[PDB]
Design an enzyme around this catalytic site. Structure first.
Site, PDB file in Angstrom:
ATOM      1  N   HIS A 131       2.186  -2.468   8.141  1.00 41.06           N
ATOM      2  CA  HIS A 131       1.073  -1.545   8.443  1.00 41.06           C
ATOM      3  C   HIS A 131       0.317  -1.845   9.717  1.00 41.06           C
ATOM      4  O   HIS A 131      -0.517  -1.025  10.127  1.00 41.06           O
ATOM      5  CB  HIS A 131       0.094  -1.394   7.258  1.00 41.06           C
ATOM      6  N   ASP A 182      -3.150   3.456   0.247  1.00 39.19           N
ATOM      7  CA  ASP A 182      -2.932   2.011   0.353  1.00 39.19           C
ATOM      8  C   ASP A 182      -3.636   1.301  -0.771  1.00 39.19           C
ATOM      9  O   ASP A 182      -4.649   1.793  -1.296  1.00 39.19           O
ATOM     10  CB  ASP A 182      -3.549   1.575   1.678  1.00 39.19           C
ATOM     11  N   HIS A 189      -4.901  -1.546   0.108  1.00 42.64           N
ATOM     12  CA  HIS A 189      -5.792  -2.297   0.972  1.00 42.64           C
ATOM     13  C   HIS A 189      -6.479  -1.398   2.002  1.00 42.64           C
ATOM     14  O   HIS A 189      -5.860  -0.513   2.555  1.00 42.64           O
ATOM     15  CB  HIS A 189      -4.980  -3.350   1.740  1.00 42.64           C
ATOM     16  N   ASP A 209      -7.364  -2.431   4.997  1.00 41.05           N
ATOM     17  CA  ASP A 209      -6.818  -2.826   6.319  1.00 41.05           C
ATOM     18  C   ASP A 209      -7.897  -2.760   7.396  1.00 41.05           C
ATOM     19  O   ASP A 209      -7.642  -2.346   8.538  1.00 41.05           O
ATOM     20  CB  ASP A 209      -5.597  -1.955   6.667  1.00 41.05           C
ATOM     21  N   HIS A 260      -1.433  -6.861   9.947  1.00 39.11           N
ATOM     22  CA  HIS A 260      -1.270  -5.679   9.109  1.00 39.11           C
ATOM     23  C   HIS A 260      -2.481  -5.393   8.242  1.00 39.11           C
ATOM     24  O   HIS A 260      -2.594  -4.273   7.713  1.00 39.11           O
ATOM     25  CB  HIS A 260       0.058  -5.705   8.300  1.00 39.11           C
ATOM     26  N   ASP A 290       1.035   3.666   2.908  1.00 36.24           N
ATOM     27  CA  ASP A 290       1.497   2.366   2.517  1.00 36.24           C
ATOM     28  C   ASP A 290       1.998   2.441   1.095  1.00 36.24           C
ATOM     29  O   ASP A 290       1.259   2.771   0.157  1.00 36.24           O
ATOM     30  CB  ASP A 290       0.334   1.373   2.645  1.00 36.24           C
ATOM     31  N   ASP A 324       2.557   0.302  -1.026  1.00 40.98           N
ATOM     32  CA  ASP A 324       1.883  -0.564  -2.022  1.00 40.98           C
ATOM     33  C   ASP A 324       0.624   0.064  -2.658  1.00 40.98           C
ATOM     34  O   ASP A 324       0.040  -0.484  -3.579  1.00 40.98           O
ATOM     35  CB  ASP A 324       1.631  -1.975  -1.508  1.00 40.98           C
ATOM     36  N   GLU A 334       5.677  -0.430   4.899  1.00 45.47           N
ATOM     37  CA  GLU A 334       5.689  -1.605   4.049  1.00 45.47           C
ATOM     38  C   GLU A 334       6.847  -1.689   3.058  1.00 45.47           C
ATOM     39  O   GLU A 334       6.814  -2.500   2.162  1.00 45.47           O
ATOM     40  CB  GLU A 334       4.318  -1.871   3.376  1.00 45.47           C
TER      41      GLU A 334
END
Ligand SMILES: N=C(NO)NCCC[C@H](N)C(=O)O
Ligand SMILES: N=C(NO)NCCC[C@H](N)C(=O)O
Ligand SMILES: [Mn+2]
Ligand SMILES: [Mn+2]
Ligand SMILES: [Mn+2]
Ligand SMILES: [Mn+2]
Lengths: 295, 297
Positions: free
Chosen positions: A98, A124, A126, A128, A141, A225, A227, A270
């Site tokens: 990312h 995501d 996260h 980020d 990332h 992302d 995840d 990712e």
């Protein structure tokens, strides 16, 4: 309502994090039939490959690991997007980690006039939004949206032709939040739905909120992302976090994002096929298919 | 490695209507599965892929002299016109089939891309000469007719796809070993240059390449049409009409390596991969041939 062309940019980037394999995301999505998915959507696919750096990874303690490689990739990525971005066609960036989100957003910004309003939906686990001063890992990332708003090292923040602002961001699925990120989200009132929020209110409400938020914007960019998705469905990824978005909700989300007329660019990031290849890759291709209205 | 271009143009041609077996239309898809795009990545940072429309109509399985003529016509016209736009003497164009009836479209497209006065050379690597007409074809399968159509022997709907005809003097056959009565006639009557697979074994592929170099000195461009059934069936199983005593894989890789060094070569067809007959051994050997063309070992 089919496109004349899709621009497909493969971004073999691993230097935003430490695990080997995320740079082979594009190659393994091709192996699992990504080009055949694109064939249902356009007769022309213009593929670009961003140059893969080949230097040894910096695996010690540092606040900003492999900055040269993140910088070089993001600059090339920005400049390629600036040339190929087109409001009548579709651009898809396949990562890679990312950290490439700094390059993708910079590229969209570069493609538009300076006064343009660019919206970002960031799906995501996260946010980020860490910096080298507060990052727990030094992994870039985890910093791209911070760099995009102008919080970060000069080498990275200067990749933006100008900064986006926290009001331009909609988070979806976030659930692993660091101290600095919690501060930014609450201090700047950044719009978000955590995964728990999504479970509570439903993805229909999330889509309505996205439509309302970006109604006066010129374009929207989606950075997805994988995840964000619950680890039951997405195993081949470097930083899985439990209690994620269901696959059903993720497919619905992609389907509805795909109907937004202002959306002309999407990142899929990712996927690390060396962590797990088949279950993950096939679920990633379902998400991409749903974006395009296929399934 | 070896070959770097600004761009490769990749045209996927999902054509089965030149013959009767299902599966050859999935050639491109299965070469992608086995890593074709990653092979192209070693050669150019930009790949412009086009997909020719796949017809979906029923196969015409009765008696006729020219089976599924509508579908071969439609595909070859689209193919011709797509090549005409994308063909480029400073980059490379690769057409992945699909059956060999597409060779009419590919050669027509090269011809259309060039000036009307251009000389286009064709190297046809194949177990078969593909120079039957509807009147002498044993099968009615158009994949056995494209070189006849390219020289103007064939039904009007196919011969008219050519902006103008090539001539039998423009052709070099390599690997031919299964020849019909009408093809033998054309080869001997028109003195068509060839090396049979037995010829190759006797004289070596080095001599074949030298003869190709010498023949096409007078020409503007060369087009290679590579039917994988040229290769011995020990190495290439997934193909509809395998013929024993073919070109060895070693010789085929050397052939491709040497063709790839020819400055006049700007377009290549790879045809007749039927992954439904055999997928993995075949597909991986097809990718080796393509890799060798590009200088990758
Ligand atoms: N998978 C990536 N991007 O979404 N995670 C990045 C952040 C992980 C963690 N917050 C860090 O900065 O180390
Ligand atoms: N394998 C393809 N392309 O070479 N064609 C073979 C044709 C076999 C036979 N000559 C016929 O006309 O039916
Ligand atoms: Mn992320
Ligand atoms: Mn993440
Ligand atoms: Mn043939
Ligand atoms: Mn043949």
């Amino acid at each position: 309502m089919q496109f004349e062309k899709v621009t497909y940019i493969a971004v073999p980037q691993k230097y935003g994090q430490k695990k080997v394999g995320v740079e082979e995301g594009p190659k393994f999505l091709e192996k699992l039939g990504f080009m055949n998915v694109l064939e249902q959507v356009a007769k022309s696919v213009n593929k670009k490959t961003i140059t893969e750096p080949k230097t040894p990874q910096e695996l010690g303690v540092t606040n900003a690991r492999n900055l040269n490689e993140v910088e070089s990739v993001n600059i090339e990525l920005r400049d390629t997007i600036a040339k190929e971005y087109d409001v009548n066609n579709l651009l898809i960036n396949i990562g890679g980690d990312h950290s490439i989100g700094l390059g993708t957003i910079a590229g969209v910004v570069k493609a538009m006039k300076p006064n343009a309003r660019v919206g970002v939906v960031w799906f995501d686990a996260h946010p980020d939004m860490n910096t080298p001063e507060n990052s727990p890992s030094g992994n870039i990332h985890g910093m791209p949206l911070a760099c995009a708003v102008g919080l970060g090292p000069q080498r990275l923040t200067s990749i933006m032709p100008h900064y986006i602002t926290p009001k331009d961001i909609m988070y979806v699925g976030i659930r692993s939040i660091d101290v600095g990120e919690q501060f930014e989200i609450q201090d700047k009132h950044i719009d978000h739905f955590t995964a728990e929020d999504v479970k509570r209110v439903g993805m229909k409400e999330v889509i309505e909120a996205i439509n309302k938020k970006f109604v006066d914007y010129d374009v929207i960019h989606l950075s997805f992302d994988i995840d964000g998705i619950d680890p039951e469905f997405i195993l081949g990824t470097g930083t899985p976090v439990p209690k994620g978005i269901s696959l059903e909700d993720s497919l619905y989300f992609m389907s509805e994002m795909g109907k937004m007329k202002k959306l002309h660019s999407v990142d899929i990031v990712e996927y690390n096929p060396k962590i797990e290849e088949e279950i993950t890759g096939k679920n990633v291709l379902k998400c991409i298919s749903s974006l395009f209205g296929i399934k």
